[PDB]
Amino acid sequence: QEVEFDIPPQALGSALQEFGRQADIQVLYRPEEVRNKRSSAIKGKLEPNQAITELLRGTGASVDFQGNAITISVAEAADSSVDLGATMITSNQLGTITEDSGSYTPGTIATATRLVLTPRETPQSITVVTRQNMDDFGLNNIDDVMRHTPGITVSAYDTDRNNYYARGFSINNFQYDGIPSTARNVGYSAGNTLSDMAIYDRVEVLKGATGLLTGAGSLGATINLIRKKPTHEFKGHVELGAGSWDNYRSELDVSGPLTESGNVRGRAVAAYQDKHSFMDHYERKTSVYYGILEFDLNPDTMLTVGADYQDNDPKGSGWSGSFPLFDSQGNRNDVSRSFNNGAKWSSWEQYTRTVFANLEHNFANGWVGKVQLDHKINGYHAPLGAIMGDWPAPDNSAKIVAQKYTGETKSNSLDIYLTGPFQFLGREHELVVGTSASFSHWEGKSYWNLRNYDNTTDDFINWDGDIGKPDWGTPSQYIDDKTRQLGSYMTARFNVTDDLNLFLGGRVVDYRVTGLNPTIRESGRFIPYVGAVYDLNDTYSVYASYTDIFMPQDSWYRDSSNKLLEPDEGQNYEIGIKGEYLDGRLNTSLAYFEIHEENRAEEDALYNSKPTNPAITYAYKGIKAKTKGYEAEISGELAPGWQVQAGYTHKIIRDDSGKKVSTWEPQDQLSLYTSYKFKGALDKLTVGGGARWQGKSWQMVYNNPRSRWEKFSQEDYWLVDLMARYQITDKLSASVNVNNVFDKTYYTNIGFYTSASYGDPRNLMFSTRWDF
């Protein structure tokens, strides 16, 4: 719809980049196609489709309208065969925006290598949850999004922390707009489990080994969250929701030009949610604020400054699971799903804030440079109190553990990179080269020396959280940890033939951790990157890649000799086929993959039975492990108003014992989410549904009172969602979401410190949304 334009005659490359910007659209073009060409002048209010063909007059170009993207091509009379994965330069470094795309499949993405590529062009497993998918299913936070993410399993540590698995491993890599955070442990990492989606366009999950842009990190995957950006037209909405257990949510989002020419633009979002829960005496208020301004210093240099803020403020938090598995005599405890072991005053409050600045420049080359500066804060205030241990006792009394943790981590990041195309042997290729630095500082106080507290409660069966609050006494411990990460990286994408694209790159990493532990250091560590994509027809490509990652170990992971273990490392080997239909409106993929891990920390049973180094007292042992499995997915348009996202993933991970490991992550899982937009008389109704299933999962847990190990199983189960929206008015809609329709009762945690957690019972959410 009608946009204000001002793009004078210049190199067609520049014009296309200016167009993408002014029109809030991604423009993809082939560098050698536009190189000796110039745009014709556009001036005024114009519909973006009229506008582009007017800009291209005289250039010989054609336009492929593809939602939030256009692609430009210059056809010849000649044409000996098509080059589907030809090197394309792009106007948006983050990819295609998903907001207003109406689709559950992404456009282009840069999660893999920093190069802006389509899913078919990326030689790794890339899954995305689109803006519209979030809107349709009411996914309001990162936990809601992970639960809906093909290939991910969400399980619970406690009421205010979940765990995300992929391919056998806990995910501990998070990016924001491609900027990696420090996530060594829960210190640096408060609130990462809890981010509200109000401020984000989409969440993009790269699965396998993602050392190339993450730097030091975990195996499994990275989760990349892309922030909402300002726009050239005014727009906003307000949203109100009410759900089971007095779950109330409001949200405001406003975006647009802040000056008459449109050279400064901003976006603001505020969101607030206050809920109780099916769990007794648990509640959580969350607040989120977001502000971003874009200044055009000149038509090819842009400055962006931005801040965000999220406070997560619960009451009735637990430390570990919702209730203890065994009672005092070893019998399994049986409790309502409402049971909550946390005390009334117990709280794991968690907060995050960022300030950030970027500068982006277009070099008359077609080359583009970017500088990203981040100040990030991850704090926590955690006076925790829960029933814990083998309780009840026969008289129905039980005992509380109570500990208080406060702290804050401050991080500063600088990321600079350069990207562009280059000719080599008569063909067009592209390259990213970049360097990064992060310094991040964790400071904290801990309190376990309670003064004159009576930690017993007379009544377990009717436990309510109504116990007293202890004198925390003085701090037990001060934390001072500093982690410093330096990286340098480069990837090149060679268009070797009309059908074959070769990916060569890597990262060199420097990682120092400093503080009250003995210093931990890796210098000059190389993380390789190799992949290829081979086109088979207009529809299908096969691909293969070899990718790597490492993480220096926590300092308590020492060995026999008191030496810190070598870093936890791994390689992902992947081969697959990806399909593309309806001009990128539908994507399919099928992959086989193996993760080889090395230096996985392992207890060291034989030493640990009788320490013999006066030196250490609980040494570990560095072992190998392997993930084997395969994965199928589909996302996009099945028929004109019919959108899906679905996946199947199978895995088994074994360690150097032979024995299966990560046995809480099911060996088999499936998601299908879908919605349909009617036409004719009912074109204002959208209907929708979804199902997630997982096979058997289990844990070995030790029953102290009976002195024996036990298997705990969660049999396979299904979960079903349903959804409907009516657009009653141009400006007003109403939705209902129903979750776990069949009220399946099941576990999200069995075995975390000998405790258990239930998943959510049937719950509804009702919302209205107002678009100005």
417 burial level (CB within 10 Å; 0-12, 13-18, 19+): buried
Cα separations (Å) of 77 from 37, 60, 74, 80? 18, 12, 10, 10
Which CB sits closer to ligand N8E, 232 or 404?
232
Smaller CB separation from ligand N8E, 4 or 83: 4
Q: Would you state the structure tokens that stand for residue 480, as one six-digit string?
A: 């001072």
Sequence-separated (6 or more) residues with CB below 8 Å from residue 262? 4, 22, 232
Least Å from the CB of residue 759 to ligand N8E: 14
Least distance in angstroms from the C-beta of 244 to ligand N8E: 7
Helices 48-55 and 12-22 meet at what angle, rounded to 10? 170
Q: Rule CB under 6 A: is residue 742 a binding residue for ligand N8E?
A: no
One character per residue 345-384, x = contact with ligand N8E (rule: CB under 6 A): ----------x-----------------------------
Select 266 or 314, whichever has its Cβ closest to ligand N8E: 266
The region of 115-123, 265-273, 430-438, 568-576 touching ligand N8E under the rule CB under 6 A is 265-273
Q: Choose the stretch contacting ligand N8E; rule: CB under 6 A; options: 303-311, 425-433, 546-554, 671-679.
A: 303-311
**Residues composing the chain:** 772
Count other C-beta atoms under 10 Å from residue 581's C-beta. 16
What are the strands, taking DSSP E only, across 299-447?
301-315, 323-324, 349-363, 367-387, 398-423, 428-447
Q: Which of these segments, 30-38, 266-274, 435-443, 460-468, binds ligand N8E (CB under 6 A)?
A: 266-274
Residue 412 beta carbon to ligand N8E: minimum distance, rounded to whole angstroms? 14
User: Phi and psi of 451, rounded to 5°?
Assistant: -110, 120
Interface pick for ligand N8E out of 295, 592, 698, 766 (rule CB under 6 A): 766
Q: What is the Cα–Cα distance from 584 to 96, expressed in whole angstroms?
A: 12
The DSSP output letter for 48 is H
C-alpha–C-alpha distance, residues 184 and 175, integer Å: 14
Cα 286 from Cα 738, distance rounded (Å): 22
If one asks whether residue 254 binds ligand N8E (CB under 6 A), the answer comes out as yes
Applying CB under 6 A, among 263, 560, 703, 768 the residue interacting with ligand N8E is 768
Binding piece for ligand N8E, criterion CB under 6 A, among 210-218, 551-559, 711-719, 732-740: 732-740
Minimum CB separation of residue 353 from ligand N8E in Å reads 11
Cα angle 85, 89, 90 (rounded to 5 degrees) comes to 110
Stretch that binds ligand N8E, among 144-152, 254-262, 459-467, 635-643 (CB under 6 A): 254-262
- CB-nearer residue toward ligand N8E: 291 or 369: 291
Give the residue, chosen from 75, 82, 258, 461, that forms a contact with ligand N8E under the rule CB under 6 A.
258
3-state helix, strand, coil in the chain (%, to 5): 5, 55, 35
* Helix H or strand E encompassing 200: strand 200-208
Binding segment for ligand N8E (CB under 6 A), chosen from 51-59, 304-312, 514-522, 595-603, is 304-312
The verdict on 285 binding ligand N8E (CB under 6 A) reads: no
Strands 367-387 and 349-363: antiparallel
Does 74 sit near ligand N8E (CB under 6 A)? no
Strands of 62-66's sheet in order across = 62-66, 69-73, 26-29, 89-90
Binding mask 209-238 for ligand N8E (x = CB under 6 A): -------------------------x----
Q: Which is nearer to ligand N8E, 295 or 592 (CB)?
A: 295
**CA nearest to 489, candidates 521, 527, 519:** 527
Question: Closer CB to ligand N8E, residue 245 or residue 546?
Answer: 245
Among 738, 753, 770, 771, binds ligand N8E (CB under 6 A): 738
Is 305 an interacting residue with respect to ligand N8E (CB under 6 A)? Answer: yes
Part of the chain binding ligand N8E (CB under 6 A), chosen from 281-289, 377-385, 406-414, 733-741: 733-741
User: Is residue 392 reached through a cis peptide bond, with omega within 30 degrees of 0 on the bond before it?
Assistant: yes
Please tell me the distance from the alpha carbon of residue 87 to that of residue 622, in angstroms, as a whole number: 43
Which C-beta is closer to ligand N8E: that of 447 or that of 758?
A: 758
Single out the segment in contact with ligand N8E by CB under 6 A; choices: 126-134, 330-338, 677-685, 762-770: 762-770
Q: 652 burial class (0-12, 13-18, 19+ CB within 10 angstroms)?
A: middle
Nearest to 344 by CA among 513, 465, 433, 185: 465
Report in angstroms how near the CB of residue 336 gets to ligand N8E at its nearest: 14
- Between residues 336 and 613, which has the closer beta carbon with respect to ligand N8E? 336
Q: Which conformational region is residue 730 in: left (phi greater than 0), alpha (psi within -120 to 50 degrees), or beta?
A: alpha
- Which residue in the set 42, 209, 268, 368 belongs to the binding site for ligand N8E (CB under 6 A)? 268
Q: Under the criterion CB under 6 A, does residue 557 sit at the interface with ligand N8E?
A: no
In the complex, the smallest distance separating the C-beta of residue 324 from ligand N8E, rounded to whole angstroms, is 27
In the complex with ligand N8E, the residue whose CB is nearer, 358 or 588, is 358
Burial (0-12, 13-18, 19+ Cβ within 10 Å), 711: exposed
What does the block give as tokens for 488? 């340098």
The phi, psi pair for 317, rounded to 5°, reads -60, 150
Q: Check binding of 245 to ligand N8E (CB under 6 A).
A: no
Contact 485, 511 (CB under 8 A): yes
- Considering only the stretches 62-70, 631-639, 655-663, 731-739, report the one whose residues sit in contact with ligand N8E under the rule CB under 6 A: 731-739
Span interacting with ligand N8E, options 74-82, 98-106, 119-127, 261-269, rule CB under 6 A = 261-269
CB of 757 to ligand N8E, least distance (A): 19
Which of the ranges 3-11, 101-109, 454-462, 759-767 carries the binding residues for ligand N8E, by CB under 6 A? 759-767
Q: How many residues bind ligand N8E (CB under 6 A)?
A: 21
21 or 207: CB nearest ligand N8E: 21
Contact with ligand N8E (CB under 6 A): which of 74, 293, 437, 687? Answer: 293
Comparing CB distances to ligand N8E, the nearer of 278 and 630 is 278
Among 41, 74, 307, 437, binds ligand N8E (CB under 6 A): 307
Token code pair at residue 503? 């990916």
Residue span binding ligand N8E (CB under 6 A) among the ranges 299-307, 539-547, 575-583, 708-716: 299-307
Q: Measure the CA–CA gap between 207 and 607, rounded to whole angstroms.
A: 36
Stretch that binds ligand N8E, among 44-52, 302-310, 429-437, 479-487 (CB under 6 A): 302-310
Strands 220-227 and 174-176: parallel
Q: How far is residue 162 from each of residues 143, 154, 159, 191, 621, measured CA to CA in Å?
A: 7, 6, 8, 11, 27
Taking the least distance from each CB to ligand N8E, the nearer of 153 and 244 is 244
| Residue 286 CA from chain centroid, whole number | 19
Nearer to ligand N8E, 250 or 488 (CB): 250
Residue 255 interacts with ligand N8E (CB under 6 A): yes or no: yes
- Minimal distance, residue 768 CB to ligand N8E, in Å: 5
| Residue from the set 41, 500, 520, 734 that interacts with ligand N8E by CB under 6 A | 734
- The total of other beta-carbon atoms located within 10 Å of residue 235's CB is 14
Distances (CA, A) of 113 to 118, 123, 203, 431, 674: 12, 10, 17, 10, 30
Interface contacts to ligand N8E, rule CB under 6 A: 234, 254-256, 258, 266-268, 291, 293, 305-307, 355, 734, 736, 738, 762, 764, 766, 768
